[PDB]
């Protein structure tokens, strides 16, 4: 997964992909 | 009162942003997340 990936999906999707690892801070800076 | 000012003078694209302001049969995307509501306006949720 790289950010050609990221952009891809919405945001909603992005924070359900990565809702355990990361806490959307900076998930919502990548 | 806007969005029937629009109708009427038929900015289409502008007056279903402005039906969009109150209700939406889509839900709400509020900070990227989906809403469980339809109806903008607290009053027209819960009757007052």
């Known amino acids: 997964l790289l950010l050609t990936n990221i952009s891809f999906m919405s945001f909603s999707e992005f924070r359900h992909r990565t ?3 990361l806490t959307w801070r900076e998930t919502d800076f990548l | 009162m806007v969005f029937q000012r629009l109708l009427q003078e038929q900015n289409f694209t502008e007056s279903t942003r402005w039906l969009r302001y ?5 839900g709400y995307s509020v900070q990227g997340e989906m809403q469980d509501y339809y109806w903008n306006v607290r009053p027209l949720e819960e009757d007052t």
Do not use: E, K, L
């Open chain 1, 19 to 21: 809702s355990g690892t």
């Open chain 2, 22 to 26: 109150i209700w939406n049969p889509a």
